Structure formats: C-alpha cells, structure tokens
Amino acid sequence: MNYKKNLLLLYDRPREPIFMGKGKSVFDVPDNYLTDRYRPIGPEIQNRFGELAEERIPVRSIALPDLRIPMSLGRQEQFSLFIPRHRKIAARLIDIFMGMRNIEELQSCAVFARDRINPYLFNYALSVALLHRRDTKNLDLPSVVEVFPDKYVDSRVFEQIREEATVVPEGMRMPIVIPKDFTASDLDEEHRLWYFREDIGVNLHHWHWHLVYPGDGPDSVVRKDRRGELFYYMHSQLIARYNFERFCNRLQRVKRLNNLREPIAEGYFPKLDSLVASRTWPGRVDNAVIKDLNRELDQIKQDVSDLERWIDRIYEAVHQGYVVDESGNRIFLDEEKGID
Amino acid sequence: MNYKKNLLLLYDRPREPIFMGKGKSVFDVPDNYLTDRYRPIGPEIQNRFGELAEERIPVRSIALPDLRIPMSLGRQEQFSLFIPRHRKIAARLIDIFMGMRNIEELQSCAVFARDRINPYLFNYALSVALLHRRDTKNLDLPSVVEVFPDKYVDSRVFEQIREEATVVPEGMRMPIVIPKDFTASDLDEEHRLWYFREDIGVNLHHWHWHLVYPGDGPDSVVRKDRRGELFYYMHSQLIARYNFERFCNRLQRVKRLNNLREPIAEGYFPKLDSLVASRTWPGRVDNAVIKDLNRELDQIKQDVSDLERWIDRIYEAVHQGYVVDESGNRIFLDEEKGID
Ligand SMILES: [Cu+2]
Ligand SMILES: [Cu+2]
C-alpha cells in the first residue's frame, strides 16, 4: 500500500481518465467515483483497462470535501496563477489536499477529484500539497515538461510523435528532435536569445518558484521567511542574467516599458498549443497597445489607469519611507524589512 | 527720443558709478543722488570726470518709491531667478521701473537706483521693464555678453584683457582669443559638446527667454498666451537639438536623472568667475549627492522629500487627467489647454 508511489501515478497522462491505468497499475475506483459520463460504461472499462495490469490498487470510498470551487474552472479551459480568480481556486484545492487526515485519504480524494478538475490546476495544487505535507516528503515529482509537453514544445511535433508511435513498433522508434530558434527569424534580433527565453530549465525554474512560494493558500505554504525579498531578488537576478546574455548577442541592456500607454514594439508568437484547452496562446503583434480589461469570465474589470494608480501609490510609499495599513497605521520600509 | 538713448548708457560699465563717463556722455547727478561713500567727495568727483565728454545729461531730482526690497540683495552677491526670494526682489524692482509715468521719470529712478542695487539684478529688472513699457518699445538693448563678460568667458582672459588694455594704447591693441573646449579634457566624453553647451548664442537664448516670459512679476509681463506650453516646448526642443549633437559626437541620447537619490555621475567645472560677486560658480564633483537645503539667507528650507512629493503630486494629476484649484475645483487637462 505504497500510497506515495501510487500518488505519482496521478501525474501519468493527465487527460486520460484514471481508470485507464497508469504505468503497469490500475486503480479500482468505486462506482460513485466515476464521472456521470463514464459510469454507464463501467462494465466495459473493467474489461480492457482493469485486467491488463500487474498491480491493481484498491481505493477505499470516503466522505469527500466540497470540490465545487476547484471544479468551477472548466476541463477544456486554460489555467493561470496570474488571474486572481484562478489563484483563489488553486488556493482552495491546495487547502483540501493539505487537510486530508491521512495519506490514504489523499489518494482517495485525488482519485475522485482528478477527472472532475482541469488537469493543469490539478497538477499545480497536488504538487504544492505533496511538497508541503509531512507524510509526502522525499517524493520525486515528475517534471512538468514530462507530463505537459504542450507548454514547452513547438505544437508541430505532436503529430510527428502521434504518427511515429502509431506506425512504428516501439523498439524501432526514433527520438523526435525538438525545434530550437523557431519562434522568429533573423529579421527579429530578439530571436537570438531563444536559448534563454525558451529553455525548459529556465521556464521550469519560474514554475518551481510559484510551487514553493505560492501567493494564496494555507498560511503554512504562503508564509515563508523573507519571501517578499526573494520575489525581488529572483526577478532581479533574471534581469541581470538576461542582460548578460544580451551583451553576448550584440544587443543593448533590456529597456523597461516607458509607460502603459505607448505601444509595445517587440511582438511574440509562441507557437504553442494547449491540448487541455485545444486553444493557442495567441501571439502579440508588433506595436500592440495595452488595453483596458473587461473579462467577465476571468472576473477582471480593470482599467489601465487602475494600474497607473497602484504604481503611483507604491512610489509615494517608497518615497515616504513607509506603507499605510488597512487601518491607517504606518509600517516603515526600514533597512531590514523594507525590501521584503 | 534722447531719453531712450540715455537709458542705454546705464548698461555701460555696470560696476563703474554712474557719475563716471558713460559712452561719450556724462550724467549730472543731484548731490543727494550720490551714494553715502561719494556724497562727501561729490565736488572732487564732478571735476574729475566728464569734462572729456560731449553730451552732458541733466537728471531731475524727483521723489522715488521705496527701494529697500531691491536693495536687500547686496552689491557683491550673486543673483538667481530660480531662488524664490531673488525672484520676488526682481518682481518688486520690475514693478517700480514700470510704474514711472514718464520716460524722464524712469531715467531719474534708474539713475538713483543703479549704484545702489546688485548689477545683475539691475540689468535684469531694467531690461524686462524696457521690453514691456509702451513708451520704450522697439529698443535695441545691448547684449548681456558685452556688459557682463564674466558670465560668458573663461576667467583666465580677464587679466589678459586688463593687461592688454592697460599696457597697449588703443590704436595698437590686438584681439584676445576666447578659449574653446576649456572646461574639460577628452577623458570626459561630455567635453565634445562645448560648441553647444558653452555657446554664447545658446546661453543668450536661455537668458532672453526668461526676460520675455518671466515667471514672477507684474501680471502684465507674466501672463502671455500659452506660456506654460512654450515652457514645455522650448525645453523640449533644447533636448531635441542636444540629442542631435550627441548623435554627431558618438554619444547616446541624453539619459534622464533616474531620481533624486542616485549620485549625479557627470561633474562639471565651469571656469567662470563673477566680477560682481568676486566669487566663483563652484564646480560639482563627479558622483555628487543631491542634499536637503537649509539656506537661510536665500530663505530656502526644502528637503529632497519635498521635491519628490511635488513630483508625485504632479504625476498623480496627469494620470487623473485633472489638477485641483486652491478652492477645490477641478480643471481638466484636455487636448488644448492641458499642456499649458
Ligand atoms: Cu514569477
Ligand atoms: Cu529655462
């Protein structure tokens, strides 16, 4: 009953229902644990999936926390921790996996949750939980690349893989070469930094940072010592490291955005497609304008001048040498704690 | 008129008392118009000057306005239009010079005032007056360079001239070469813009501008159409022309001061000495710190914070799209009037 090892299976093939069996194992899930769609074909499922496996994993039925908030984001929708609504949803699902009394009940709770939740969100929240619970330390989480390649690779290679896997028997299959320097041509000097910007290691680093220092969740997960300063310092070392690369590609140091009104010159077309959402990360044209936001579904109604305002407030607070509490009390930006 | 022309004789030899020869003329000064030092030896003075001269000018003794505010800046002190106290003093003098009914009565006021007031301030205040009185219009005022060379040339030439004039009779004298690129060596890249920054024409421009669009003074003189907009535009075109020159001396576009806390990289030592004040314009060392001011004589007590507060306020209005009146009313920064 190595729950720990069995939890790792929940990362295998995130869009495949859990009853299809991961690695060499299958879960034996209660009938009320199946979704409404697949409950009717329960018998057939057992037949193929259930029988072909070496290890069958019994899941004990339990009473389940309220999963509405985490289910409220759609299975074919996109997931961003930058959008407040999604942060709030993730925070809650994290609390739920943190709060299970038992590593066995975590297994049972996750098995239930998995095919009812957005896979990206499931990966995030489950990961943050496994990294923080006492009973799930020392656990070798799969790289996000390994389980969601769609966020890391030219969308063109998926059919190249689909074909190779389908036509060629495995022992004979050729590795697929991942394109590099593929997002832009020589006419865009910015393409020179492909090896920094589009390197799975640095993007994983950015992702890992939001796994260890999430912005909303249980106190235990959020409140790390000096996390406000690490935020500053990490983003600051990235720019230092990014400028080092620029100097090595005959470019200038990177220039801040002048303001939030003038166009952004450098466009970008990522060439990524999401197999979860079956929708792209739309590129941004050259010379695009920042526009007032009214995203009803995302729950974002915010003008550019609302952003201008926060920045102004923040600059006033930096110049004053203190921030003002929600009550009106002064907290000094001293030498020890000001940066945090 | 002849009175117009006599007013111009007041610009001749600024620190030489007005009873000494001006041009080919002399003023006949009512005894009580002499200063304290020279009233007692008034008789031994009238004989000692002017008998060489062709015209002699009668000055009518008249009742004069209260002259103590203009007098409060000392004759051997420096004069600045940026300093609020000095700006107020000049406004009062300007007021006086524009409040005389006749061009004759103006001659009398100026004649009296000259040897009692700071020469820089007198030249300034009279000059503004003459440019604006309805009865002294279209006057060819003499160039400031000619009257106050000490604001415009390396102080090393002053003794060169004094020698050449003292030793060599006027028929035989040769021209003094004014050094160029004299403020800094090629160790400093900024030195390359000597021909712009230290150009007499350009400096005269800056000066003439502040004579036509003075910021304090009588309403008649200050309130010009769209002068707030001129101020922006005039300063915007200076940067533009500067940048052009920078692009022609292998330099980059000028960089804003980032803020008021960072040291100023670029030092500057002007090699000018004021003969009116017998003091220098002190240089500024490289990497100098802007410091809080407590200059009591100048009546300035201002912290770098006070300036940063003003700047934050102005940024807040611009983003708001309106400023707020002393009475609490909003005035909108619209497409026509906003810049002004
Ligand atoms: Cu980040
Ligand atoms: Cu100016």
Side-chain angles (χ1 to χ4, degrees):
Chain A
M1 276 166 193
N2 196 15
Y3 293 117
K4 301 175 85 192
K5 251 201 56 188
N6 297 337
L7 289 169
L8 295 193
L9 305 172
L10 305 179
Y11 288 73
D12 213 286
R13 272 155 181 237
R15 297 192 282 121
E16 292 193 0
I18 191 164
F19 55 70
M20 274 170 79
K22 318 304 199 164
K24 286 294 198 75
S25 297
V26 294
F27 295 82
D28 281 320
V29 336
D31 291 56
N32 73 293
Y33 272 36
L34 287 193
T35 75
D36 305 297
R37 182 183 165 194
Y38 283 118
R39 210 175 301 126
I41 72 152
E44 277 79 20
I45 282 174
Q46 287 174 227
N47 279 115
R48 182 200 295 170
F49 304 110
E51 297 174 11
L52 176 72
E54 298 186 7
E55 174 194 353
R56 312 200 61 169
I57 301 165
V59 189
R60 180 181 60 99
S61 179
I62 63 164
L64 291 156
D66 167 22
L67 281 167
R68 281 177 274 175
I69 298 294
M71 287 191 214
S72 86
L73 181 68
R75 283 212 96 226
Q76 289 191 291
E77 303 283 320
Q78 181 66 251
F79 169 59
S80 150
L81 289 173
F82 284 135
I83 292 178
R85 170 187 174 232
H86 297 195
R87 273 136 67 190
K88 173 58 63 213
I89 292 168
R92 164 64 98 119
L93 187 66
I94 294 162
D95 210 16
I96 294 174
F97 297 143
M98 295 288 306
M100 297 292 97
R101 62 158 61 114
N102 188 294
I103 200 177
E104 177 190 16
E105 298 195 9
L106 182 77
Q107 183 183 256
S108 198
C109 170
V111 167
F112 183 82
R114 189 178 178 276
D115 298 353
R116 297 182 169 69
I117 290 169
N118 175 294
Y120 294 146
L121 161 58
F122 183 82
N123 171 105
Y124 176 70
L126 174 61
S127 293
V128 169
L130 296 186
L131 276 160
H132 288 79
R133 291 171 62 93
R134 300 143 160 286
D135 56 16
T136 57
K137 288 309 198 80
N138 297 15
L139 206 73
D140 192 16
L141 268 45
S143 171
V144 187
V145 195
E146 265 153 4
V147 319
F148 288 123
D150 42 305
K151 289 149 103 189
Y152 297 97
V153 157
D154 188 340
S155 80
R156 291 211 275 193
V157 315
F158 288 105
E159 286 305 310
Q160 281 180 51
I161 295 162
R162 198 174 300 287
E163 165 174 351
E164 180 80 1
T166 310
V167 170
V168 180
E170 50 229 73
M172 272 188 302
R173 292 192 201 139
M174 289 301 98
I176 169 77
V177 163
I178 297 304
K180 70 169 187 80
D181 192 16
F182 65 105
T183 62
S185 79
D186 284 10
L187 312 190
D188 182 0
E189 65 181 357
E190 290 297 354
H191 90 96
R192 287 173 202 157
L193 287 284
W194 59 268
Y195 70 85
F196 196 87
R197 296 191 283 80
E198 296 159 5
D199 164 288
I200 59 133
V202 332
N203 283 273
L204 273 177
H205 168 92
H206 193 240
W207 181 264
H208 204 102
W209 198 83
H210 299 237
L211 283 174
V212 169
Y213 307 100
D216 195 9
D219 272 286
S220 56
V221 169
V222 155
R223 296 184 164 287
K224 313 288 171 54
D225 171 58
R226 292 219 267 147
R227 67 166 280 140
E229 179 178 2
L230 274 166
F231 175 88
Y232 147 79
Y233 184 60
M234 192 253 312
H235 291 108
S236 163
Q237 285 298 286
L238 299 183
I239 292 158
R241 279 177 176 289
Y242 182 71
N243 278 327
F244 213 125
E245 305 297 350
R246 286 181 86 72
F247 277 37
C248 296
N249 285 277
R250 295 166 295 130
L251 296 174
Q252 313 270 256
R253 68 195 66 198
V254 65
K255 289 155 196 160
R256 49 181 265 125
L257 296 187
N258 289 308
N259 60 67
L260 291 167
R261 296 288 174 192
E262 93 183 22
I264 311 164
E266 311 81 8
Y268 190 60
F269 285 76
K271 313 272 177 305
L272 297 175
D273 285 335
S274 159
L275 305 179
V276 171
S278 319
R279 287 279 184 286
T280 188
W281 295 257
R284 183 186 55 259
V285 290
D286 284 355
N287 283 298
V289 173
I290 305 169
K291 277 184 228 64
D292 291 342
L293 282 191
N294 168 50
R295 304 277 299 179
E296 200 134 300
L297 249 298
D298 294 344
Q299 301 185 357
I300 305 174
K301 179 86 170 81
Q302 214 78 64
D303 299 315
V304 170
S305 69
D306 298 311
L307 183 50
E308 277 163 8
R309 196 175 74 246
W310 296 333
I311 291 155
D312 276 345
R313 285 308 88 74
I314 295 172
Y315 267 115
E316 292 156 19
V318 164
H319 303 142
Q320 285 165 339
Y322 59 89
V323 293
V324 164
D325 217 315
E326 302 194 351
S327 296
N329 308 111
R330 298 189 174 177
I331 303 172
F332 296 101
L333 299 177
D334 68 30
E335 303 178 353
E336 180 215 335
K337 295 185 178 172
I339 192 57
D340 183 55
Chain B
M1 201 50 201
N2 64 341
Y3 288 120
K4 287 174 182 161
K5 272 203 70 175
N6 306 329
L7 285 181
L8 303 191
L9 284 182
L10 302 162
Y11 294 78
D12 193 353
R13 297 273 182 119
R15 320 199 317 276
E16 282 189 9
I18 198 165
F19 53 68
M20 296 174 79
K22 270 75 176 72
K24 289 163 172 191
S25 310
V26 91
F27 285 94
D28 282 297
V29 179
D31 207 292
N32 76 312
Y33 269 33
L34 297 174
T35 51
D36 286 349
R37 162 63 184 132
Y38 297 120
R39 213 171 298 110
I41 74 174
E44 287 64 56
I45 256 51
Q46 186 62 58
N47 276 356
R48 186 176 166 117
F49 301 92
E51 259 75 67
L52 64 97
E54 319 190 316
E55 189 199 20
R56 306 163 62 71
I57 302 169
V59 181
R60 193 156 59 77
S61 188
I62 62 166
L64 296 169
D66 176 19
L67 217 50
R68 290 166 311 135
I69 287 164
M71 271 172 219
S72 73
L73 186 68
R75 287 214 95 203
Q76 274 189 305
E77 278 166 343
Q78 188 63 64
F79 172 64
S80 174
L81 289 154
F82 296 131
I83 292 182
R85 163 181 186 246
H86 293 193
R87 221 184 309 154
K88 208 37 193 186
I89 291 174
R92 179 60 204 262
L93 194 50
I94 284 164
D95 214 48
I96 296 172
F97 284 151
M98 289 210 82
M100 307 285 97
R101 46 155 81 173
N102 268 234
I103 192 171
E104 188 197 353
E105 292 199 358
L106 176 60
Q107 198 191 244
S108 279
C109 192
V111 159
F112 181 77
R114 183 170 184 285
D115 303 5
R116 292 172 158 67
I117 287 164
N118 178 282
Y120 288 138
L121 158 65
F122 187 79
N123 165 96
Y124 177 70
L126 181 50
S127 298
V128 176
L130 291 181
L131 288 179
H132 293 74
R133 291 171 64 80
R134 303 166 74 264
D135 70 6
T136 54
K137 280 302 175 61
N138 306 306
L139 245 182
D140 191 5
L141 293 184
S143 134
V144 202
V145 195
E146 299 184 304
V147 309
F148 292 116
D150 45 311
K151 284 164 143 180
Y152 296 99
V153 304
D154 177 359
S155 64
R156 279 177 291 292
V157 315
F158 269 98
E159 285 304 302
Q160 278 170 74
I161 296 160
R162 191 187 302 284
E163 189 178 318
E164 185 75 359
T166 298
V167 174
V168 188
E170 92 150 280
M172 272 151 85
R173 300 207 253 250
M174 277 320 112
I176 317 295
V177 306
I178 304 302
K180 52 166 200 77
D181 196 2
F182 63 94
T183 62
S185 88
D186 55 21
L187 298 184
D188 174 15
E189 57 189 25
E190 290 303 337
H191 95 94
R192 298 182 196 128
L193 270 69
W194 63 264
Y195 64 97
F196 187 95
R197 283 188 297 95
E198 285 148 14
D199 190 279
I200 289 139
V202 171
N203 276 283
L204 277 166
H205 171 74
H206 198 239
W207 178 259
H208 185 85
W209 193 99
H210 288 245
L211 280 174
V212 161
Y213 300 104
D216 189 348
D219 268 288
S220 61
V221 173
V222 166
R223 308 185 67 93
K224 309 270 182 61
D225 184 57
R226 288 209 274 162
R227 59 138 293 136
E229 182 177 355
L230 266 154
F231 164 99
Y232 147 73
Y233 191 61
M234 183 264 295
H235 284 107
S236 180
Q237 284 289 294
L238 298 185
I239 292 162
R241 292 195 158 256
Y242 191 62
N243 271 333
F244 218 118
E245 304 301 349
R246 292 185 78 79
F247 280 31
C248 297
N249 296 271
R250 289 183 290 116
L251 295 165
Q252 319 297 112
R253 79 192 64 191
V254 67
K255 295 172 192 315
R256 42 174 280 157
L257 291 190
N258 312 301
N259 55 73
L260 306 168
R261 302 294 186 177
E262 194 142 15
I264 298 148
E266 312 93 342
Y268 182 67
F269 283 82
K271 315 292 186 285
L272 295 189
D273 272 332
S274 167
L275 292 182
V276 169
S278 294
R279 288 278 178 280
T280 180
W281 290 266
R284 186 180 63 252
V285 294
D286 296 317
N287 301 284
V289 190
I290 308 164
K291 296 186 195 66
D292 298 339
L293 294 172
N294 167 41
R295 305 272 306 175
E296 279 205 6
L297 227 77
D298 296 323
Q299 295 166 6
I300 306 182
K301 185 104 166 62
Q302 219 77 236
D303 283 349
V304 168
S305 276
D306 301 317
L307 192 69
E308 290 186 307
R309 209 207 328 116
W310 294 340
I311 296 159
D312 285 345
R313 290 288 154 282
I314 293 165
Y315 269 119
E316 171 185 54
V318 165
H319 295 155
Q320 266 168 12
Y322 62 88
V323 299
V324 186
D325 188 352
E326 284 160 301
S327 292
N329 323 138
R330 299 185 177 170
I331 312 162
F332 289 87
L333 301 168
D334 60 17
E335 305 179 12
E336 267 215 23
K337 260 81 69 196
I339 192 50
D340 179 53

